[PDB]
Amino acid sequence: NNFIVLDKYIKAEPTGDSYQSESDLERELIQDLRNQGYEFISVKSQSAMLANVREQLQNLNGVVFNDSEWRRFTEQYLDNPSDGILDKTRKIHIDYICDFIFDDERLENIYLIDKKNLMRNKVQIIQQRYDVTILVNGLPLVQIELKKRGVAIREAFNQIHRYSKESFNSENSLFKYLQLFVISNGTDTRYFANTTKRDANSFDFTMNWAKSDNTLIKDLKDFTATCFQKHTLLNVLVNYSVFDSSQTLLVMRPYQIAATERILWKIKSSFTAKNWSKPESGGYIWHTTGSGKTLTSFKAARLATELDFIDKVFFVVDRKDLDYQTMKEYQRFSPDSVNGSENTAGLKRNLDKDDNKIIVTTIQKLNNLMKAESDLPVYNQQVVFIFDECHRSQFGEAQKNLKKKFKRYYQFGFTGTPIFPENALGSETTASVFGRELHSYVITDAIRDEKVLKFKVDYNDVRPQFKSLETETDEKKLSAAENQQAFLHPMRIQEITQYILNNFRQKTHRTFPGSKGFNAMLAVSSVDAAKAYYATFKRLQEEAANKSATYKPLRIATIFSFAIGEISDETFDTSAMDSSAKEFLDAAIREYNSHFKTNFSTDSNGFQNYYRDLAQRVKNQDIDLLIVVGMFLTGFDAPTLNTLFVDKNLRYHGLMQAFSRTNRIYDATKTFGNIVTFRDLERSTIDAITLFGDKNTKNVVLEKSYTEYMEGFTDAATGEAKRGFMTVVSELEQRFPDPTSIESEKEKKDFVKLFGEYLRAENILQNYDEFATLKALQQIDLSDPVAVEKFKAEHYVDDEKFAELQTIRLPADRKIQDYRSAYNDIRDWQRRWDDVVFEVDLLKS
Ligand SMILES: Nc1ncnc2c1ncn2[C@@H]1O[C@H](COP(=O)(O)OP(=O)(O)OP(=O)(O)O)[C@@H](O)[C@H]1O
Ligand SMILES: [Mg+2]
């Protein structure tokens, strides 16, 4: 099998020589790479480098340039001056073959890399800031930054990589070819992709290499022995990196790679055994929701097409999970054939295509196809299925005619929430359908690796009158409760909507003006609910428009089309909807059109276009709040969406998938996803988490209490003590009255450590309603208690709670700015102590 993500790996042993300075780490890095087959050469210039490339490409392609021809190949294809990192990257991954016309007029195909036979490519290393650069056919595709042992790797990542887009001179030109960065202090080694567009991911996207059980490989020697094994490295560079329709480069994380290669080997081995068309031919990957199932599964599909014996590879997704970006991606492969309709024509067309393998479609369309068409030639062909998270509504019938009509097949599935006998619900189980579990990356592991955010979950109890309904467990009483007499009661909706309007900005980190921040979804129970909330938001927002011309409204959109508490599949056919809803939808689409200057109508085509454009605008924050029923709750990917407002009954897999809309990692600003619920989901939340996990999993997944973060607590998984906000406040007032107290070195560093804690803690506490109330109390009184009474009604606080809140002592507003200016004055001096990490992202706001 030759897997590059190891099942077992025996930890290496230190040479006893000094491992402290960058010189040490570099010495042994070069030594190790050299032992693993990387030739150390000396390149002191862009010219020496170019000459080396000439040798390697000539060697590789079996050809010889003259100086003229070579100058031309350099100026046009290889080192073209107009090209940036993006262009170089497209040349590495998409078009690596230059069709070159020699001076004698013949055509040769000049390869940058041999992707069929990987080990033919020449790998070698040069050195420098301490850096070791890994050259593939002379081209610098990898770079290793080395810092000393006591250096905080995050600050070192802050340093370059966000400090900013450092120019590219004429002599460093070839280094625009860099695909992959690896940074290490020897204790910890993290790798990550080179950013093309001028965006530049945060530290949260960096990752340690790992084994198939997802246990980390942290230290440079072991990282080297594994990731930098030439076979491993080249595979990461060539096969397990992705360059997509957004022109963004992504390196796959270890778990994604392991799952993928295990799928591929499963296909190969089952084929040579003639073991096709059985559950033992395929498998399922259990990758926790939001860990990249879609990236990975489609990458596996594209890779499974590279098997000589496979005629067709189906990549099928649930039309429910389609969004603007993912549709854009699939357009390049199966044009106009991936959407929310039932039509099979596009599928039939892609199916008959000379020189093609990949067939991207929806489980709906696949189902309809296999229903209606029994004579297809693809049926007797050698076929692979990759099912990305379409396990339910149309899946049963789909599987039925699958096993019926497909004679030679290997079928696989990805899910974050598997089907177990417990939650079976009429559907065959995941294990039953796909057979063995080939790999897993489970939520606790994902949280541990910080590749998925945790949740903060609270039932908002402001509503004594409606609380009986909001806590109701019986299934039949909830169905009956949809009406203006109970759940859709005007006062309930008014009060809730008022809450969302009041606390939107606080939740989304939009509070501080001159800060970008996040946005939200509201997920509701029914079409009428959506209709009511959209109605009520518009009214309440036009009311406060009169109260003030300093009132800045939120942009609100909605989308719904004709539907336990599981999530119902909505059709994309808006002809099914009753006249009331279609009237309301049309109106909102008209408002939407006039606002965004779009032309969308409500016929299925116009609605589909509405769906696409909506997704893009919610993703980029042109929409502040998306009110929804069953849409964009399962596969929608929006790293800037941090808060989900919930008036709905969500259970089990539906629960997780809905909440997981906020689970995407972004930077130190977005600490966890915010879930705010106007029905009580506590027991359902815990049920759901425990379903995929154990009794303890909920302690990892759910964020801690307000009191804990104020007074401190002890993290169970780490074992570490996380000091509370008031102990930080206390220690700031005590140890650093300031600015006089700044002075000596140690008293500076200690202040940076402490104020780091401060900024993190306060940022975390923004999301707590208690803390919002506490901070809002800091303006208020002296004279007219019109605001004092206004403060009580808005934050739902009585005279009892109000009494002690006076006593809680926070630092003066001026003192926070003294602290902040001091923090900057230190960090800047530092740019002109290895232990420390400044919070730049938290600072910037
Ligand atoms: N290796 C990677 N490097 C950088 N970013 C990644 C990587 N893998 C995934 N992501 C990002 O994480 C986000 C979520 O990925 P994706 O939607 O593919 O996950 P998912 O498991 O399908 O989520 P869901 O369970 O909600 O459908 C995407 O924006 C994706 O770009
Ligand atoms: Mg997905």
Author numbering: 12 to 139, 149 to 583, 591 to 859, 873 to 885
What does the paper say about this structure?
The main chain can be traced for residues 217–219 in the Lys220Ala mutant, though with less confidence than in the WT or Lys220Arg structures. In the Lys220Ala and Lys220Glu structures, where the residue 220 sidechain does not form a hydrogen bond with ATP, the helix-like segment is rotated so as to bring the alpha carbon of Asn221 into the position of the alpha carbon of residue 220 in the WT and Lys220Arg structures. In these two structures the Asn221 sidechain points toward ATP and partially fills the space that in the other two structures is occupied by the sidechain of residue 220, but the Asn221 sidechain does not approach the ATP base edge closely enough to hydrogen bond as Lys220 or Arg220 can. A nearby region in 3D space, encompassing residues 181–191 (hereafter 180s loop) is resolved only in the Lys220Ala structure, and there only partially, with the backbone traced confidently through Arg182. Residues 183 to 191 can be traced with less confidence through weak electron density in both monomers of the Lys220Ala asymmetric unit. The resolvability of the 180s loop in the Lys220Ala structure appears to be related to the rotation of the helix-like segment bearing residues 220 and 221. This shift that brings Asn221 into the position of WT Lys220 places Ala220 on the opposite side of the helix-like segment, where its carbonyl group comes within hydrogen-bonding distance (3.2 Å) of the Arg182 guanidino group.
Type I RM enzymes house these activities in a multisubunit complex having ATP-dependent translocation activity that pulls thousands of duplex DNA base pairs through the stationary enzyme, eventually cleaving at random sites distant from the recognition site. Upon identification of an unmethylated specific DNA sequence, two HsdR motor subunits, which bear the endonuclease and ATP-dependent DNA translocation activities in the fully assembled DNA-HsdS-HsdM2-HsdR2 complex, start to translocate the duplex DNA toward the stationary enzyme from both directions, producing two extruded DNA loops flanking the enzyme complex. The X-ray crystal structure of the HsdR subunit with bound ATP from the Type I restriction enzyme of E. coli plasmid R124 revealed four structural and functional domains forming a planar array: one nuclease domain of PD-(E/D)xK type that houses three endonuclease active-site residues and a QxxxY motif common to the RecB-like nucleases; two RecA-like helicase domains of SF2 type that use ATP to translocate duplex DNA without unwinding; and a C-terminal α-helix-rich domain presumed to contact the HsdS-HsdM2 methylase. ATP bound between the two helicase domains was found unexpectedly to also contact Lys220 of the endonuclease domain, suggesting a means by which nuclease and translocation activities might communicate.
